[PDB]
Amino acid sequence: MIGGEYKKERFSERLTRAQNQPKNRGYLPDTHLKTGGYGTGTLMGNWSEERSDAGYYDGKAVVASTLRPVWSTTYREMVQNVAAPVDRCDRTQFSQQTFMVIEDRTGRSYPGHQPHLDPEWQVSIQSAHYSTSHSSYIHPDVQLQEAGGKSSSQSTGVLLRLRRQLELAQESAFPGNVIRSVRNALAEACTDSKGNINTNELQEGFAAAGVTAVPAECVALLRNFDCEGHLTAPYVVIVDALRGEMNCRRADLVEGVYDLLRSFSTDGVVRLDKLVEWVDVEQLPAVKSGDVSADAARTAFAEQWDARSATAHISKERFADFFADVSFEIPQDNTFELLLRNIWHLSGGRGTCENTSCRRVEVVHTNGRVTKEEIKNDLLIKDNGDDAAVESLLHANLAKQGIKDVKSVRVV
Amino acid sequence: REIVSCQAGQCGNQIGSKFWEVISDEHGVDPTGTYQGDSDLQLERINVYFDESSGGRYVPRAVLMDLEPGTMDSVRAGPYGQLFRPDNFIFGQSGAGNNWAKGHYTEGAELIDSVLDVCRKEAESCDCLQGFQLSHSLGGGTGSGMGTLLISKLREEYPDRIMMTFSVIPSPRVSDTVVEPYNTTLSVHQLVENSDESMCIDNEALYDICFRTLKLTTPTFGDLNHLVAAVMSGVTCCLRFPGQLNSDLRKLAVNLVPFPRLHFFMMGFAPLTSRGSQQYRGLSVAELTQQMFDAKNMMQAADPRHGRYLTASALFRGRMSTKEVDEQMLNVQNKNSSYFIEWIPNNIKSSICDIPPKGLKMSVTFIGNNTCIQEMFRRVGEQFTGMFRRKAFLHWYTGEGMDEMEFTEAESNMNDLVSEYQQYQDATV
Amino acid sequence: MREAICIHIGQAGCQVGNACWELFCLEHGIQPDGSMPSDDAFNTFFSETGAGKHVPRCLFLDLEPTVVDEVRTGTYRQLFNPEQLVSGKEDAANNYARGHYTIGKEIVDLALDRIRKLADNCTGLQGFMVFHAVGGGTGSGLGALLLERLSVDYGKKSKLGYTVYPSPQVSTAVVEPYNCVLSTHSLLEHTDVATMLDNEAIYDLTRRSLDIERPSYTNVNRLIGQVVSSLTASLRFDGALNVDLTEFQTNLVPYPRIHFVLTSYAPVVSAEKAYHEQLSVADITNSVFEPAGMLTKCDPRHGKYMSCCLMYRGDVVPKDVNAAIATIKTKRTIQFVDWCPTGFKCGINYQPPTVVPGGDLAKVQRAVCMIANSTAIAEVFARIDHKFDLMYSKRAFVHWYVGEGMEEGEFSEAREDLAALEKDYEEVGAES
Amino acid sequence: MREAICIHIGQAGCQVGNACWELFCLEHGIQPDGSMPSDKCIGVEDDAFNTFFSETGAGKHVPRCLFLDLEPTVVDEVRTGTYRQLFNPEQLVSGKEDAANNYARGHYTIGKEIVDLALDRIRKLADNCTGLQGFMVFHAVGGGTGSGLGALLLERLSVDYGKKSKLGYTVYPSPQVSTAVVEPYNCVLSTHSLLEHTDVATMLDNEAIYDLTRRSLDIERPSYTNVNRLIGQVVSSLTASLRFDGALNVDLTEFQTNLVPYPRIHFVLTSYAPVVSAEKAYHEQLSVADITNSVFEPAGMLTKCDPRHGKYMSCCLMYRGDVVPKDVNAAIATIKTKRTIQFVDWCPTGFKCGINYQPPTVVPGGDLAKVQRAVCMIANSTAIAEVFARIDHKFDLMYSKRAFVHWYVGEGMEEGEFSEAREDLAALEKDYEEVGAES
Ligand SMILES: Nc1nc2c(ncn2[C@@H]2O[C@H](COP(=O)(O)OP(=O)(O)OP(=O)(O)O)[C@@H](O)[C@H]2O)c(=O)[nH]1
Ligand SMILES: Nc1nc2c(ncn2[C@@H]2O[C@H](COP(=O)(O)OP(=O)(O)OP(=O)(O)O)[C@@H](O)[C@H]2O)c(=O)[nH]1
Ligand SMILES: Nc1nc2c(ncn2[C@@H]2O[C@H](COP(=O)(O)OP(=O)(O)O)[C@@H](O)[C@H]2O)c(=O)[nH]1
Ligand SMILES: [Mg+2]
């Protein structure tokens, strides 16, 4: 370490006239540790083993003049790239207390022991504090509580861990609030205009969203997702990776829902006001159980739609991401399909996923034949208060479907 | 289960001082005797080696023996010197002269009355005395003479208790005395008869470990004593700490002593990693077992590959699984069937203790009864007999009170032990 | 009613008890304090007190205090009685002579006093279940002493020794064959049924069916406790075919000296693999009868089965077990002895096997444990006596026994008991 | 699993190992302390580093490479350098005195006193590996130690590990410019050992790479650092197929068996594309076909041996990055139609292509430009007979009247060894011509 006080002659040795023996400290003249007959500088024989000692002071000053600074060699100039710059095993950070303990050579299991250089000393002491049977037979409650080579493998493991922790946290009037709040927290933690986030901002974004993230966790995330080489990545890709890739079946269902909405659009363009007017929030499980009201469900629906205007435009990617959040936080494909079909009145599905929202109609034809038919895609056909208008809409939908010989329709 | 320890001579006193430093580090005891251990396990079984006073000071159950008062002066001047009681120090006036006769017949004998008095005081203070520990060097006079006399006596006053003696065997490469063979010969026949287990430490092997196993540039007698203290605590860790395979002194003695005269064991400690390779050599049961049976890691100078293992004991420390340590013994038995005796199945006793050495993840102490133990006795045999041919330095012993007969009796008993090791080295089913 | 008294001897027995009692507490909804926060079925293993606490009918014995003090300082300190949790002062040091002659009598009186208190508390005592290891000193010495005293004090009460044996090659003692051969003398006369509980088979089962890199005594003792609970659940819970201690005693023991039995358990699978394979009754029965799915290193294909008892737990069906029996009988790899045409005692319990969290067993809707008396068990004796003889040829490690009150002949009675124990198995396995 | 042990022999091996290990640490995110940051571990416990780095109980990663050089300067300065914490005090063996361009000295006097501990260190490196794929010996036949001690170590490795996969990246003397005067002697003497105990030998002469980095990478004055970095990039491209997953993956044995038709014919020319700096790259459309044509052209090769006067036998292509199998097939079709390079008649397919998803990473402070995709072409071809004829004609001129032979015979070598090596290389010329001859 700098200076080398712990190698210098101490006050006790002066006051007792103590000498080199039996404590070979080398402070006195003619008492240096000669290995090979030469100093630790003249490195022969046992020099490397001597230098490996914790209480070893090299003897080179830390400040050098710049008027003769040409003595480097090929290996030195090749390794200067990885050499650490200069200002529990850091000898520089060690205090004189530990240094003189090392010099006195106390608290060692065997001669030549280096407790301070050993990095696992603390855990070894903690383990020695306990017996095998005591540690084995911990109380059951707290015992139960204690239960590849790719460049992106470590980050994808990080994503898996964060995803499972979010799932455990899950185990909200309208679905999507988990990823909604995660994205909101990252956006708030942002201090950059174009959506770029550093390690600390990313960490506190998870902290606000409710995710425990190590600084190394965040650094791994940003090092995988970084493209400009500044240890900084957009938050959108991180959030999408955390949400996970969309399932094929649910993605097909979302595409079908958007196709239905696009067909139902007045101008052929999906719009937020028509979206929120056409959504039937009454058929959410929470609304059915009475946990939340329809007005609260619609307010949340808009709230995590996050549209800057009440008449904003919803596109492929926006719809896909918005229902991908719901797909992520709903674990069962069958129940997700049932919920989506119930909300958006898509006729179809098999068995448990078969749509139950559409109005089954008993239709008597002109010949008296009675058939139990199912209406398809009746989003805009709602209770407008006019039974005649509803009946006419049902007839128009049936005629478009293909049954033209109808004479009476009754909703079952 | 209390173990009370006694340290004879300068070598024994310094080894025991390092041992008590290690014990107090393990149990969280300051030199002032108070307690700072953050674990209840460091205080649950502190009574094995310590006794609480009225003020609560934890004082070790230790007795100290050396003729020279300078040994006690150095012991007190040590960092943990005040841990001991003042009345456990029994020192004479003049030195032993490194004469076994002086330490065993005239000066040590006139000094050992108070030694027995204080030892029996500690024994009575102990609730149920597990055993007696000795730390001494057989090459010296006061370490060998007084140590032999004390173990001899304690055999009669305590016949059913364990006699665990750590004897420092002199060897020619680190020989620094001419009466080393005389003292070793005159002490081996008390060790063979008055010690339930008498395990040996050799300075050659300690220096070899510090040179090529730890690669330390300049350790000292302090670091040799540190290794000996680490194994000293590891041999009894199972008493003071819980474990999956609890063990104690009699546990080890029964499994390591097939016949009463075969109680001299090797000594080894793992892990032993150079400070340059500590951060690199991953600590594991397989690595520990690989280091255990290596000849260099053994603190016995005799090469174990030449001999055939009577028995072995593996005192593991730390949290580890059981088959990952038993299958290692299976491997060392199967792939090295020539180095282990055939008519003894499962030559290795294994035990597991929960608490590793302070700050280490795991460790192990290896105590092996092998036929290579006889090499020290043979080499000291020719060293002793060559001197004994023509009265080399014998007049000091004779004039101190010893007679011509006892030297030959000692060498004959040592030869009997050597022959006992031979007749089992090449034994066949 | 139907109370059974659990006794644990030695370190192995203490750990087995410390692994089975939390399983019992979880099964009966008993917290470590011994209360139910929020039906008389615990009476078999727990004694009710007017304060609402449930004290187990357990005795813990060991000459050395480390394991019992660990239990006293553990989680179940408030559950276990301060008494009946006794301790010695010096261990047996794997010396059967020390455990049976010198240190035995100074604690056997207290042990019998505590067992007498437990039996007085129990108004319908079905029998005793002792857990020990014959390879140790306390397990062999104190085990033999307690077996003899219990046999002479309680008449013909059923006694189940779920005892751990020296495994063929992975063993952690050298005088262990001596301790085994010496403890056999007691385990023949004073034991009603002995269950083999070696360690290598458990190790292999864990390493080849659970994919655990580092399992140890914690896992092996959890599995032993699972086996014990499966065996004893028949009377603690209702079922289609309930069995009693004496009932499978009669169904399993053909001759008084033939009472050493192999044990097996299935389906022992990990949590990762729990939800993949088709764990039917037939599949679990086949896994049971597979050589690699048992709890003892003793291949039955070299021997012949004499009586197999199958405890099914969960949603098992009597016709499912009948189909399993039919398939097993048609299967020729295993051989039944000629004089036992039926050879099957199957019982059904409706309580699924509870899994302790953090263990290796996974929550499975059904399971089955087999207790099989078979002629193949002669192999463990044929190897333990060989191991004993290799040291007894010139009797190494016998001065320790002699100095502890053992006559030199006791080894000879041990050897003759082993000889007769192999010989009567050979005789009963021989074809008529 | 899939571990591979690197063994660096000689000074050239030491510098090449330094370059390739810097590259490997940068690719796997390992700092000179030896511990991956929390970023590179928190995702998953990836086994990519397993083949080159072994983890310890503290999470530190230690390379599976034994440095072994007789003279102490290079290994000593590596120990003193920044990678001291990254490398072990062991596994980084340094001897006592160099062979000094003496194969006899490095194989009979100084080699034996270190080969035993070298094999002991290799044993401690190999028992750690549970799925070791093979060894990769990095050396230069020109140097005395890299020839002699390398040959001894290769012999011991073969006799101890049986038929284990054994690649060797070796720097042969350049046909036109070379440093030593005894270098032809060392090359000829070590050629016998390479034949006997080398599964595949990759050509890494100096002047070809120097011209390549002069004309393509535009480095007008590159030192040893740039050529070593290029060699390390080639090695990383070759070995990344198992570290990182790809559409078509190869291991140590697939390209071995696809490039070795006969046991004695295992010497392979190497080429890498696109070796482009930051300036010539942004003007050019670096497509798969473009890089394939560039790596097949003799200008883009790393060995001074043009294939126009040679006869192609089998080419292994290692694609890295966003390379598509259909682009690879288009490149193969274009190569087949092109008549400037011709394949041997009895090997119609002659191609072993494998794609990896890991783009090459540029070392900071280097000169290669970070590109989306790259290709490494390893060609077993009869053209190597040209460079071997050059070297053995050089050796014949050396040995015409017994020049520089007293140094070798004073180090414990019989004089007949030179004749034996010369006749072995002559038989190698003969069998190259035989396999090149049309049936
Ligand atoms: N299943 C199981 N077996 C064990 C366990 N601990 C030890 N054993 C085995 O039991 C054998 C001896 O058990 P014990 O009867 O307690 O003998 P001990 O452990 O030496 O204790 P003492 O007899 O008092 O000396 C040992 O050889 C071990 O193989 C354990 O926790 N679970
Ligand atoms: N590509 C490359 N080749 C090198 C390098 N260093 C040396 N060489 C080649 O190696 C040949 C001589 O061997 P050296 O590497 O210099 O030394 P050595 O192989 O260790 O053999 P000794 O001189 O006995 O130590 C020279 O002709 C160079 O062409 C290097 O850093 N990179
Ligand atoms: N390991 C170790 N050995 C020692 C120590 N002090 C002395 N010895 C050995 O003991 C031998 C001499 O013993 P000696 O001093 O005569 O014993 P004493 O008569 O009891 O004091 C020497 O060969 C030393 O190797 C020590 O502190 N540690
Ligand atoms: Mg015990």
Ligand SMILES: [Mg+2]
């Ligand atoms: Mg060199």
